[PDB]
Amino acid sequence: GRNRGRLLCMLALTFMFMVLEVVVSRVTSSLAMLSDSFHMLSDVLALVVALVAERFARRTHATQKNTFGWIRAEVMGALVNAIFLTGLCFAILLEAIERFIEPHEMQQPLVVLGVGVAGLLVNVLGLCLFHHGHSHGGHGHGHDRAGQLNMRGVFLHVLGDALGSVIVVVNALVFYFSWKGCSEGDFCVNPCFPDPCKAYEAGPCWVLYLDPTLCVVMVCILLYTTYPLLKESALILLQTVPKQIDIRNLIKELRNVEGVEEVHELHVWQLAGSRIIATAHIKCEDPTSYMEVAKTIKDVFHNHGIHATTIQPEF
Amino acid sequence: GRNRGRLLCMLALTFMFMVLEVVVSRVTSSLAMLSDSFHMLSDVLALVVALVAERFARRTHATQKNTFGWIRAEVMGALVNAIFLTGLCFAILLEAIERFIEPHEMQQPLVVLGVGVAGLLVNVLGLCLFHHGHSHGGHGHGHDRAGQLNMRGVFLHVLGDALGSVIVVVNALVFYFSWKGCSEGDFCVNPCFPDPCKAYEAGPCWVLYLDPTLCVVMVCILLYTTYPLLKESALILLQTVPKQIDIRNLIKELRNVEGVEEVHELHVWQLAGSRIIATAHIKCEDPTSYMEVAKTIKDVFHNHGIHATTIQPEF
Ligand SMILES: [Zn+2]
Ligand SMILES: [Zn+2]
Ligand SMILES: [Zn+2]
Ligand SMILES: [Zn+2]
């Protein structure tokens, strides 16, 4: 409820800021603003993926197209958001390099500054806002993490953009305060800026390379903060034993338990969130005591937290 | 062996064509070629993430950080390649739109045509070249798909680029054969092309919008051919029952087996490739006949192909 509401609100606000950019470009007769319209198309794509994902994670029930259900869909949503952000980070880095090798000068600094401040406000609002395993429930004795991962994915995109907004605002301010370049055409020369199109002193060209370098630094930050989630997400999709559980201790402890000849094929794997699933085979001697033995076996897995289990007797 | 060899060969050839583009740009004093040097960073990135996938998928061996192995790592490699291609497709579409709204004219058509023909040859070479679940093996009676998915992922990128090379070559040819635009400056006017920088008849402007539209069409093709894999890959990561297996028939057939009145918690899920894993609970009356009953139970799962199983008795 709350999560879907937050995502829908941000998607709606994102469309509103898209319309604001388009109309501002229309009044100003500029096209790079329209280019900013498309970054907005990309934030809208992250938000829509995070959401298919919330509806779907909710169908936590035993369908027959998935005997397990869909919570893993939410983890995958987090994963794909992370991968999308990493791809956008690489494309941003390659644009930063392309602007380092080819400096780019912009026009109408005031409207750029205004749209950048508005985007900074929107992104700060988003960052403040976004701050059948038979497991989550039931003691589990028998005869929520995914939400955090999905929101951290959306939070990283919003942070990414926010850093983009900070870079645009700072660059526009530095241009307006410290760049005195010439465009009138009378006593006009651009020594630093190459490519002064076709055939006083211009502004300090060092400032223009202020834009690339910070962007590069920016992506590093994002990549750093992106790395744990895509690690965590790709391990929720690798059937790796969760870090809290160690298998060597489990094997020796199980065998310690009475009546148990062995264990073989112990697979412990983590479902989406805290729904760790473990299946085992346990050799015994007397099948009748097997049941009490199996309850002891359930007690072990249990101490270790694995409260969903299937342990074949293999007499 | 063969797969790692193909991937390493294409990565090496990709670096060679990167160096060729950089040196050609150096001789020609052009920078958009350097832009082509960067798409190359992306083809190289797919090729590396398709590989770490190959390196890991072979460690199919009961580790204690992952009790299943890493074949799922290969499926995830396929998945991430697909997602990367889809992201590049969206960015390409948004660049195509940005060039539709702002037409772009290029210089030095001959070197662009040569690099495009070389890239077309490289991409055609790549397309012709790239054309413990205890399941793959063992009868499995007891007391390779992932490679296709990973290569189809790499094949789709290579196809994507190949279509990019075809578009660049065709556009360069059409410019050289049907575009007679003016740049000398004497009896010179660009009516269609707006933004003729700062202050005869130019070439037909309809051709210049030839570049955007085809690109858009191109991405559609890619998206179409990309959709099944990312569906197939994201279901290998959703624990959904494989399409060949239906659960309703399985439940009734297991119930029809003599000595069984119950099944509960039937989970059937597909490991990476054809390593379908199914765990079940089966209630019985006489534990001694349970063993022969369990062999019958193994026969059922088996017919259905589920060749790894754990089936707790719950007497
Ligand atoms: Zn963004
Ligand atoms: Zn317990
Ligand atoms: Zn490519
Ligand atoms: Zn069989």
XYZ file of C-alpha atoms and ligand atoms in Angstrom:
634
model
C 0.000 0.000 0.000
C 2.537 2.589 1.113
C 5.183 1.393 -1.352
C 2.860 1.392 -4.364
C 1.603 4.812 -3.323
C 5.121 6.245 -3.165
C 6.063 4.777 -6.546
C 2.876 6.005 -8.226
C 3.294 9.474 -6.725
C 6.884 9.769 -7.969
C 5.935 8.491 -11.434
C 3.136 11.064 -11.611
C 5.397 13.887 -10.410
C 7.986 12.725 -12.952
C 5.465 13.090 -15.765
C 4.596 16.556 -14.415
C 8.244 17.638 -14.476
C 8.520 16.179 -17.979
C 5.630 18.380 -19.128
C 7.219 21.355 -17.353
C 10.495 20.793 -19.218
C 8.744 20.413 -22.580
C 6.687 23.596 -22.153
C 9.718 25.548 -20.892
C 11.671 24.401 -23.955
C 8.699 25.453 -26.092
C 8.653 28.968 -24.629
C 12.449 29.264 -24.755
C 12.819 27.521 -28.160
C 15.535 25.176 -26.864
C 16.084 21.501 -27.569
C 18.604 20.324 -24.970
C 15.779 20.812 -22.464
C 13.915 18.381 -24.545
C 16.941 16.258 -24.112
C 16.305 16.496 -20.428
C 12.871 15.318 -21.229
C 14.344 12.085 -22.037
C 16.267 11.469 -19.034
C 12.953 11.739 -17.566
C 11.729 9.017 -19.851
C 14.450 6.902 -18.226
C 13.539 7.626 -14.642
C 9.985 6.752 -15.592
C 11.240 3.407 -16.861
C 12.897 2.615 -13.597
C 9.908 3.471 -11.707
C 7.631 1.293 -13.879
C 9.938 -1.693 -13.453
C 10.060 -1.287 -9.741
C 6.295 -1.427 -9.860
C 5.472 -4.399 -11.912
C 7.565 -5.661 -9.366
C 5.431 -4.613 -6.290
C 2.243 -5.977 -7.759
C 3.894 -9.067 -8.560
C 5.575 -9.608 -5.290
C 2.355 -9.468 -3.733
C 0.990 -12.484 -5.377
C 2.752 -14.562 -2.846
C 0.720 -17.559 -3.408
C 0.916 -20.937 -4.916
C 0.057 -20.575 -8.410
C 0.473 -23.316 -10.879
C 2.747 -21.375 -13.092
C 4.884 -20.965 -10.195
C 4.686 -23.343 -7.344
C 6.575 -21.076 -5.283
C 4.975 -17.822 -5.992
C 6.448 -14.420 -6.944
C 8.613 -12.644 -4.228
C 11.612 -13.510 -6.382
C 9.956 -11.272 -8.958
C 10.485 -8.351 -6.572
C 14.137 -9.293 -6.029
C 14.611 -9.475 -9.806
C 12.984 -6.060 -10.129
C 15.618 -4.708 -7.757
C 18.311 -6.477 -9.790
C 17.166 -5.100 -13.139
C 16.913 -1.597 -11.683
C 20.524 -1.914 -10.514
C 21.653 -3.175 -13.935
C 19.787 -0.346 -15.664
C 21.451 2.206 -13.400
C 24.880 0.670 -14.069
C 24.245 0.869 -17.813
C 23.155 4.491 -17.544
C 26.268 5.163 -15.455
C 28.517 3.705 -18.143
C 26.749 5.709 -20.857
C 27.078 8.846 -18.719
C 30.788 8.178 -18.238
C 31.260 7.771 -21.980
C 29.380 11.005 -22.592
C 31.569 12.728 -20.014
C 34.656 11.506 -21.871
C 33.130 12.584 -25.201
C 32.624 16.059 -23.737
C 36.151 16.073 -22.340
C 37.565 15.431 -25.815
C 34.943 17.719 -27.432
C 33.979 20.613 -25.150
C 30.368 21.751 -25.488
C 29.061 25.260 -24.865
C 25.416 25.855 -23.930
C 23.037 28.776 -24.380
C 20.436 30.426 -22.140
C 22.119 29.756 -18.769
C 19.175 31.089 -16.738
C 16.573 28.583 -17.940
C 19.111 25.773 -17.517
C 19.747 26.935 -13.951
C 16.022 27.073 -13.210
C 15.339 23.610 -14.561
C 18.362 22.308 -12.642
C 17.176 23.803 -9.354
C 13.707 22.345 -9.944
C 15.211 18.932 -10.674
C 17.373 19.194 -7.563
C 14.270 19.909 -5.480
C 12.422 16.969 -7.050
C 15.339 14.618 -6.460
C 15.786 15.761 -2.849
C 12.097 15.076 -2.292
C 12.539 11.596 -3.737
C 15.609 10.828 -1.620
C 13.923 11.945 1.592
C 10.832 9.901 0.699
C 12.754 6.745 -0.303
C 15.058 6.560 2.736
C 5.411 -20.026 -0.672
C 8.558 -20.201 1.409
C 6.239 -20.713 4.342
C 8.882 -18.656 6.001
C 8.094 -15.084 6.652
C 5.392 -16.651 8.726
C 4.241 -19.516 10.795
C 6.582 -20.790 13.434
C 6.962 -23.317 10.662
C 7.100 -26.400 12.806
C 4.795 -28.887 11.089
C 3.815 -32.552 10.947
C 10.300 -8.510 4.058
C 13.843 -7.846 2.790
C 12.736 -7.768 -0.866
C 10.845 -4.536 -0.201
C 14.075 -2.994 1.056
C 16.012 -4.229 -1.975
C 13.435 -2.859 -4.427
C 13.341 0.505 -2.692
C 17.112 0.704 -2.433
C 17.180 0.150 -6.206
C 14.765 3.020 -6.772
C 16.649 5.094 -4.194
C 19.877 4.604 -6.121
C 18.359 5.785 -9.319
C 16.862 8.819 -7.590
C 20.272 9.489 -5.996
C 21.855 9.185 -9.427
C 19.633 11.669 -10.913
C 20.010 13.918 -7.851
C 23.750 13.956 -8.417
C 23.030 14.786 -12.050
C 20.874 17.707 -10.923
C 23.599 18.912 -8.561
C 26.152 18.803 -11.375
C 23.865 20.717 -13.753
C 23.039 23.396 -11.157
C 26.685 23.872 -10.131
C 27.833 24.011 -13.753
C 25.172 26.577 -14.653
C 26.080 28.720 -11.638
C 29.795 28.559 -12.434
C 29.112 29.478 -16.060
C 26.969 32.447 -15.027
C 29.489 33.651 -12.430
C 32.906 32.875 -13.934
C 32.442 32.380 -17.695
C 32.617 35.543 -19.812
C 32.756 33.967 -23.255
C 32.043 35.914 -26.421
C 29.259 35.342 -28.945
C 28.416 38.825 -30.298
C 30.965 38.605 -33.122
C 32.680 42.002 -32.761
C 36.099 41.840 -31.100
C 35.382 38.150 -30.582
C 37.729 35.163 -30.380
C 37.554 31.711 -28.775
C 41.152 30.550 -28.254
C 40.427 27.613 -25.965
C 37.172 26.492 -27.394
C 38.073 24.863 -30.522
C 35.675 24.447 -33.271
C 34.332 27.953 -33.021
C 31.944 26.896 -35.796
C 32.941 28.317 -39.184
C 35.597 31.022 -39.162
C 38.226 40.661 -26.254
C 39.130 37.302 -24.719
C 36.670 34.477 -24.173
C 35.864 32.981 -20.800
C 38.291 30.749 -18.911
C 38.176 27.389 -20.685
C 39.186 25.484 -17.546
C 35.664 25.931 -16.230
C 34.211 24.177 -19.262
C 36.068 21.054 -18.341
C 34.564 21.329 -14.939
C 31.494 19.619 -16.398
C 33.178 16.335 -17.525
C 35.391 15.636 -14.510
C 32.677 16.009 -11.857
C 30.399 13.748 -13.900
C 33.144 11.118 -13.898
C 33.526 11.475 -10.134
C 29.746 11.253 -9.846
C 29.523 7.912 -11.614
C 32.234 6.481 -9.368
C 30.111 7.304 -6.328
C 27.066 5.696 -7.923
C 29.027 2.630 -8.995
C 30.326 2.224 -5.459
C 26.871 2.468 -3.930
C 25.476 0.318 -6.733
C 27.908 -2.557 -6.214
C 26.501 -4.144 -2.996
C 22.890 -4.313 -4.195
C 23.664 -5.958 -7.515
C 25.888 -8.299 -5.554
C 23.207 -8.965 -3.052
C 20.590 -9.175 -5.748
C 22.583 -11.451 -7.963
C 23.158 -13.776 -5.078
C 19.496 -13.906 -4.300
C 19.446 -15.238 -7.858
C 22.325 -17.679 -7.474
C 20.953 -20.101 -4.842
C 24.000 -19.301 -2.727
C 23.707 -20.118 0.951
C 22.859 -16.913 2.864
C 25.805 -15.373 4.683
C 24.247 -15.929 8.120
C 24.271 -19.707 7.491
C 27.471 -21.748 7.194
C 27.258 -25.256 5.787
C 30.291 -26.833 7.458
C 28.885 -26.232 10.946
C 25.427 -27.424 9.864
C 26.736 -30.737 8.483
C 28.720 -31.563 11.615
C 25.883 -30.527 13.945
C 23.352 -32.509 12.102
C 25.393 -35.579 12.258
C 25.890 -34.963 15.910
C 22.193 -35.515 16.305
C 21.212 -38.996 17.436
C 20.244 -41.828 15.153
C 21.433 -40.048 12.122
C 23.773 -42.000 9.940
C 24.555 -39.168 7.491
C 23.459 -36.285 5.312
C 23.777 -35.981 1.616
C 22.549 -33.491 -0.818
C 22.163 -30.665 1.572
C 21.029 -27.805 -0.391
C 20.253 -24.629 1.415
C 19.206 -21.752 -0.626
C 17.672 -18.458 -0.025
C 14.315 -17.543 -1.449
C 13.555 -13.887 -2.002
C 13.782 -12.128 1.345
C 14.085 -14.214 4.523
C 12.563 -17.448 3.197
C 15.647 -19.662 3.350
C 14.791 -23.110 1.952
C 16.814 -26.212 2.852
C 16.332 -29.786 1.655
C 18.287 -32.749 3.019
C 18.475 -36.553 3.012
C 19.043 -38.280 6.363
C 19.941 -41.950 6.754
C 18.570 -43.695 9.842
C 18.338 -47.215 11.314
C 14.897 -47.558 12.943
C 12.089 -45.907 10.937
C 9.801 -45.487 13.963
C 12.292 -43.384 15.867
C 12.890 -41.641 12.588
C 9.929 -39.419 13.307
C 11.322 -38.227 16.609
C 14.718 -38.114 14.926
C 13.173 -35.998 12.193
C 11.724 -33.628 14.766
C 15.229 -33.334 16.193
C 16.416 -32.761 12.638
C 13.806 -30.032 12.268
C 15.092 -28.573 15.522
C 18.572 -28.325 14.040
C 17.650 -26.733 10.815
C 15.651 -24.647 12.948
C 18.176 -23.378 15.231
C 19.968 -22.319 12.188
C 16.854 -20.438 11.020
C 15.894 -22.648 8.098
C 12.284 -23.062 8.845
C 11.194 -24.663 5.520
C 12.539 -28.013 5.011
C 12.055 -31.295 3.391
C 14.270 -34.052 4.680
C 13.980 -37.450 2.962
C 14.281 -40.421 5.123
C 16.222 -42.766 2.813
C 16.021 -45.709 5.183
C 36.487 -24.811 -24.525
C 34.894 -23.846 -27.829
C 32.624 -21.237 -26.235
C 35.399 -19.527 -24.276
C 37.552 -19.576 -27.395
C 34.865 -17.880 -29.482
C 34.239 -15.217 -26.837
C 37.944 -14.491 -26.361
C 38.499 -14.300 -30.118
C 35.647 -11.815 -30.587
C 36.818 -9.702 -27.639
C 40.327 -9.602 -29.108
C 39.048 -8.725 -32.589
C 36.858 -6.057 -30.976
C 39.903 -4.451 -29.378
C 41.652 -4.603 -32.771
C 38.768 -2.805 -34.484
C 38.776 -0.279 -31.638
C 42.450 0.472 -32.310
C 41.703 0.673 -36.042
C 38.960 3.245 -35.416
C 41.160 5.316 -33.097
C 44.087 5.408 -35.541
C 41.780 6.185 -38.484
C 40.289 9.068 -36.492
C 43.839 10.196 -35.699
C 44.837 10.267 -39.371
C 41.547 11.875 -40.419
C 41.343 14.246 -37.401
C 37.740 13.249 -36.638
C 36.059 12.657 -33.302
C 32.767 10.924 -34.108
C 34.929 7.945 -35.079
C 36.122 8.105 -31.572
C 32.491 7.982 -30.709
C 32.387 4.729 -32.564
C 35.385 3.686 -30.554
C 33.132 3.905 -27.627
C 30.264 1.894 -28.699
C 32.921 -0.425 -28.633
C 33.352 -0.200 -25.013
C 29.812 -1.641 -24.894
C 30.372 -4.476 -27.187
C 33.412 -5.327 -25.104
C 31.311 -5.151 -21.943
C 28.812 -7.601 -23.238
C 31.447 -9.877 -24.226
C 33.105 -9.794 -20.785
C 29.815 -10.303 -18.888
C 28.994 -13.149 -21.133
C 32.231 -14.600 -20.172
C 32.475 -14.257 -16.503
C 29.395 -16.123 -16.998
C 31.236 -18.861 -18.886
C 33.954 -18.989 -16.268
C 31.573 -19.488 -13.606
C 29.224 -21.880 -15.117
C 31.686 -24.524 -15.166
C 32.219 -24.618 -11.520
C 29.310 -26.935 -11.241
C 30.490 -28.346 -8.056
C 29.011 -28.296 -4.592
C 30.765 -25.444 -3.146
C 30.012 -24.264 0.307
C 29.181 -20.783 -0.711
C 26.886 -22.203 -3.166
C 25.525 -25.698 -2.586
C 24.077 -25.900 -6.116
C 27.029 -24.636 -8.131
C 27.042 -21.788 -10.655
C 25.036 -22.856 -13.710
C 22.497 -20.254 -12.625
C 25.392 -17.824 -12.927
C 25.446 -18.551 -16.666
C 21.682 -18.032 -16.947
C 22.039 -14.718 -15.101
C 24.831 -13.744 -17.483
C 22.413 -14.284 -20.355
C 19.793 -12.241 -18.491
C 22.087 -9.292 -17.808
C 23.270 -9.294 -21.422
C 19.630 -9.086 -22.524
C 18.920 -6.243 -20.078
C 22.031 -4.386 -21.239
C 20.952 -4.733 -24.861
C 17.445 -3.492 -24.011
C 18.935 -0.466 -22.254
C 21.186 0.279 -25.214
C 18.150 -0.102 -27.483
C 16.191 2.453 -25.471
C 19.133 4.871 -25.484
C 19.503 4.363 -29.242
C 15.801 5.061 -29.741
C 16.070 8.259 -27.719
C 19.089 9.318 -29.753
C 17.163 8.580 -32.938
C 14.347 10.825 -31.711
C 16.869 13.505 -30.698
C 18.270 13.392 -34.235
C 14.774 13.502 -35.708
C 14.048 16.729 -33.827
C 17.616 18.011 -34.410
C 19.033 16.815 -37.739
C 22.784 16.212 -37.729
C 25.109 16.533 -40.714
C 28.407 14.630 -40.842
C 31.725 15.249 -42.574
C 34.172 13.017 -44.456
C 31.647 10.514 -45.871
C 34.334 8.215 -47.307
C 36.037 7.336 -44.016
C 32.622 6.840 -42.404
C 31.669 4.482 -45.232
C 34.914 2.541 -44.862
C 34.568 2.126 -41.120
C 30.929 1.110 -41.610
C 31.806 -1.553 -44.178
C 34.538 -2.874 -41.876
C 32.094 -2.996 -38.967
C 29.537 -4.750 -41.158
C 32.130 -7.385 -42.057
C 33.076 -7.840 -38.394
C 29.449 -8.166 -37.336
C 28.649 -10.638 -40.126
C 31.602 -12.720 -38.977
C 30.255 -12.650 -35.432
C 26.726 -13.617 -36.480
C 27.932 -16.541 -38.577
C 30.176 -17.687 -35.718
C 27.510 -17.328 -32.992
C 24.677 -19.138 -34.802
C 24.491 -30.022 -8.376
C 21.017 -30.384 -9.764
C 22.253 -33.863 -10.503
C 20.116 -33.543 -13.559
C 22.114 -33.190 -16.676
C 23.512 -36.542 -15.781
C 23.117 -39.835 -14.109
C 20.028 -41.772 -14.755
C 19.311 -40.080 -11.451
C 17.517 -43.070 -10.033
C 18.929 -43.173 -6.539
C 18.674 -44.726 -3.100
C 23.157 -27.714 -21.549
C 20.487 -25.087 -22.310
C 22.340 -22.356 -20.385
C 25.081 -22.389 -23.022
C 22.446 -21.691 -25.660
C 20.929 -18.873 -23.605
C 24.310 -17.213 -23.019
C 25.235 -17.448 -26.683
C 21.846 -16.212 -27.827
C 22.432 -13.191 -25.575
C 25.789 -12.506 -27.199
C 24.268 -13.221 -30.616
C 21.608 -10.587 -30.010
C 24.130 -7.977 -29.152
C 26.205 -8.845 -32.212
C 23.013 -8.698 -34.311
C 22.246 -5.317 -32.776
C 25.494 -3.925 -33.679
C 25.289 -5.538 -37.132
C 22.054 -3.674 -37.740
C 23.827 -0.536 -36.551
C 26.589 -1.175 -39.085
C 24.038 -1.729 -41.848
C 22.328 1.556 -40.992
C 25.629 3.464 -40.972
C 26.770 1.971 -44.298
C 23.421 2.615 -46.014
C 23.253 6.166 -44.665
C 26.799 6.930 -45.818
C 26.083 5.511 -49.280
C 22.848 7.488 -49.603
C 24.621 10.666 -48.504
C 27.408 10.130 -51.034
C 24.990 9.301 -53.863
C 21.960 11.537 -53.258
C 23.045 14.375 -50.942
C 24.524 17.436 -52.663
C 24.597 19.817 -49.714
C 26.668 22.985 -49.701
C 29.542 23.894 -47.385
C 31.883 26.055 -49.511
C 30.139 29.306 -48.554
C 29.753 30.914 -52.000
C 26.232 30.692 -53.425
C 25.412 28.592 -50.373
C 22.153 28.147 -48.461
C 20.685 25.410 -46.252
C 16.894 25.844 -46.325
C 15.957 22.520 -44.755
C 18.803 22.110 -42.390
C 18.073 24.483 -39.733
C 20.700 25.794 -37.530
C 23.171 26.428 -40.302
C 25.439 27.594 -37.470
C 25.868 31.370 -37.401
C 24.488 33.224 -40.406
C 22.787 26.905 -55.211
C 20.395 24.658 -53.290
C 21.458 22.223 -50.594
C 20.877 18.495 -50.747
C 17.442 16.932 -50.297
C 16.716 17.124 -46.571
C 14.400 14.104 -46.675
C 17.445 11.866 -46.886
C 18.799 13.246 -43.623
C 15.772 11.959 -41.827
C 16.463 8.622 -43.341
C 18.937 8.090 -40.500
C 16.469 8.421 -37.552
C 13.534 6.404 -38.893
C 15.523 3.294 -39.861
C 17.212 3.341 -36.452
C 13.771 3.347 -34.837
C 12.707 0.423 -37.019
C 15.973 -1.288 -36.116
C 15.350 -1.134 -32.383
C 11.873 -2.592 -32.848
C 13.406 -5.642 -34.516
C 15.924 -6.010 -31.702
C 13.274 -5.543 -29.028
C 11.155 -8.227 -30.661
C 14.017 -10.699 -30.818
C 15.122 -9.642 -27.340
C 11.757 -10.283 -25.693
C 11.721 -14.134 -25.558
C 15.190 -14.501 -24.027
C 14.636 -12.018 -21.224
C 11.329 -13.758 -20.670
C 12.941 -17.118 -20.691
C 15.836 -15.865 -18.638
C 13.704 -14.114 -16.098
C 11.682 -17.237 -15.625
C 14.765 -19.288 -15.059
C 15.125 -16.787 -12.221
C 11.546 -16.985 -10.980
C 11.304 -20.642 -9.864
C 8.368 -21.021 -12.239
C 7.504 -24.565 -13.230
C 9.012 -25.286 -16.673
C 6.506 -25.171 -19.514
C 6.934 -28.873 -20.326
C 5.670 -29.760 -16.819
C 2.101 -29.109 -15.666
C 1.326 -29.321 -11.966
C -2.367 -30.229 -12.107
C -1.664 -33.480 -13.961
C 1.265 -34.279 -11.653
C -0.818 -33.882 -8.475
C -3.617 -36.130 -9.712
C -1.204 -38.755 -11.061
C 0.735 -38.837 -7.786
C -2.557 -39.156 -5.909
C -3.652 -42.052 -8.135
C -0.582 -44.016 -6.992
C -1.531 -46.766 -4.554
C -0.779 -46.027 -0.914
C -1.071 -42.262 -1.437
C -3.877 -40.181 -0.295
C -1.812 -36.937 -0.119
C 0.787 -34.487 -1.481
C 1.549 -31.109 -0.089
C 4.090 -28.538 -0.763
C 4.925 -29.665 -4.207
C 7.424 -27.344 -5.504
C 8.881 -27.952 -8.868
C 11.330 -25.495 -10.075
C 13.780 -25.315 -12.814
C 17.468 -24.987 -12.155
C 19.617 -23.410 -14.829
C 19.301 -25.505 -17.967
C 17.547 -28.886 -17.777
C 18.036 -29.539 -14.053
C 14.406 -29.381 -12.940
C 14.232 -29.812 -9.151
C 11.068 -31.012 -7.400
C 10.464 -31.526 -3.683
C 7.306 -33.093 -2.255
C 5.632 -34.431 0.891
C 3.844 -37.754 0.682
C 1.601 -39.147 3.412
C 1.503 -42.935 3.734
C 0.092 -45.605 6.078
C 2.705 -48.380 6.370
C 6.298 -47.077 6.556
C 7.834 -50.328 5.275
C 5.927 -50.237 2.019
C 6.764 -46.570 1.963
C 10.089 -47.423 0.401
C 8.523 -49.269 -2.499
C 5.879 -46.552 -2.560
C 8.664 -43.993 -2.709
C 10.260 -45.812 -5.621
C 6.881 -45.631 -7.341
C 6.821 -41.957 -6.404
C 10.260 -41.564 -7.957
C 8.898 -43.305 -11.037
C 6.182 -40.679 -11.328
C 8.378 -37.699 -10.969
C 10.552 -39.464 -13.229
C 8.220 -39.941 -15.973
C 7.539 -36.318 -15.866
C 11.302 -35.753 -16.205
C 11.872 -34.418 -12.696
C 14.961 -36.307 -12.082
C 16.074 -34.765 -8.711
C 13.785 -35.138 -5.876
C 13.370 -35.148 -2.198
C 10.071 -36.511 -0.947
C 9.502 -36.442 2.845
C 7.218 -39.070 4.256
C 5.278 -37.349 7.022
C 3.970 -40.686 8.204
Zn 17.817 9.068 -14.123
Zn 11.733 -23.171 14.914
Zn 26.927 -2.913 -29.547
Zn 14.041 -41.823 -14.361
